């Protein structure tokens, strides 16, 4: 069984000048909290440890880009980091990463805002990401797929009950996942580049996430 009330509690349980080094510090910090979040999602902690590792290594960036984007809904043209720092669009642009930052804004934050995506809905989206059965090396893909199926069935039923006037809302929620996937990848390419040029500090867990597998 996969109750939305539990996913929601997961969410509530973990809530808190190169703008880039601030952004990267926030990410490293929230990688620790992501572990705490994942353990509160039903059945995750029951999977084999190696699979838990695979799901987190494959999903972390998406999982955490979804989180700070949802937090930023009430921010005009910027993002709110878990540190408390607001980062404006103009400062991302001034630091050479304006284009990627705008895509977070336009494809994620603003669409979350326009639909007023709620915290249960976020949590379900992020559970869906976490239970990614395409993740390579999973000892049993079918099982993760099944956990995913139960999350999206509970979400569908949450949407139909809570927002019965909006028959499309469910689909619309899932249709943010392609943008999330691409924004995650494009942000990883920037990070691999920061690491390479070696300018920007990257803290230890962030760095570990940027290692090759094994």
């Amino acid at each position: 069984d996969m109750p939305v009330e539990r996913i929601l509690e997961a969410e509530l349980a973990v809530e808190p000048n190169d703008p880039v080094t601030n952004i990267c510090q926030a990410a490293d910090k929230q990688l620790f909290t992501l572990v705490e979040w994942a353990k509160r999602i039903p059945h995750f902690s029951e999977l084999p440890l190696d699979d838990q590792v695979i799901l987190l290594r494959a999903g972390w960036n998406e999982l955490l880009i979804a989180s700070f984007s949802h937090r930023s809904i009430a921010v005009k043209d910027g993002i709110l980091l878990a540190t408390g720092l607001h980062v404006h669009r103009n400062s991302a642009h001034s630091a050479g990463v304006g284009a990627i930052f705008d895509r977070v804004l336009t494809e994620l934050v603003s669409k979350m805002r326009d639909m007023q995506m709620d915290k249960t809905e976020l949590g379900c989206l992020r559970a869906i990401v976490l239970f990614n059965p395409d993740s390579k090396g999973l000892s049993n893909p079918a099982e993760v797929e099944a956990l995913r199926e139960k999350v999206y069935a509970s979400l569908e039923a949450y949407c139909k009950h809570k927002y019965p006037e909006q028959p499309g809302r469910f689909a619309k929620l899932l249709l943010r996942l392609p943008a999330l996937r691409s924004i995650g990848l494009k942000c990883l390419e920037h990070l691999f580049f920061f690491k390479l040029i070696g300018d920007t500090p990257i803290d230890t867990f962030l760095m570990e996430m940027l290692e090759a597998p094994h």
């Binding site: 620790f32 838990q52 590792v53």
Partner: peptide, 9 residues
């Protein structure tokens, strides 16, 4: 994967 393992329990 060291840090992640340790945090996972």
């Amino acid at each position: 994967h060291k840090i992640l393992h340790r945090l996972l329990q």
